[PDB]
Design a binder for this molecule. Structure first.
Ligand SMILES: [Zn+2]
Ligand SMILES: [Zn+2]
Ligand SMILES: [Zn+2]
Ligand SMILES: [Zn+2]
Length: 89
């Protein structure tokens, strides 16, 4: 999986595109609270499946946010899984 890029000790939970880095939540809240410009970064969640990527879709049934690839892969497996209605972040 992926370690947090500010502190390499935790695992990343979020992705900031502007900073182009994947963070854990304490780093996330630290880094973008520092100033009013970091404050206006917009940050999306890392995939809860692969953990190495940013999430394109949310699923309520899977209660998860996943990459395009992993979103497609989770709901590829079953007609059952395919029927899940996913929505973008
Ligand atoms: Zn961290
Ligand atoms: Zn940022
Ligand atoms: Zn994924
Ligand atoms: Zn689903």
């Amino acid at each position: 999986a992926r370690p947090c890029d500010t502190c390499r000790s935790n695992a990343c939970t979020v992705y900031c595109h502007a900073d182009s880095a994947y963070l854990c939540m304490s780093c996330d809240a630290q880094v973008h609270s520092a100033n009013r410009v970091a404050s206006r970064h917009k940050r999306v969640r890392v995939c809860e499946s692969c953990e190495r990527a940013p999430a394109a879709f949310l699923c309520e049934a899977d209660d998860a946010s996943l990459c395009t690839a992993c979103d497609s892969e989770v709901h590829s497996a079953n007609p059952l899984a395919r029927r899940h209605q996913r929505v973008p972040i």
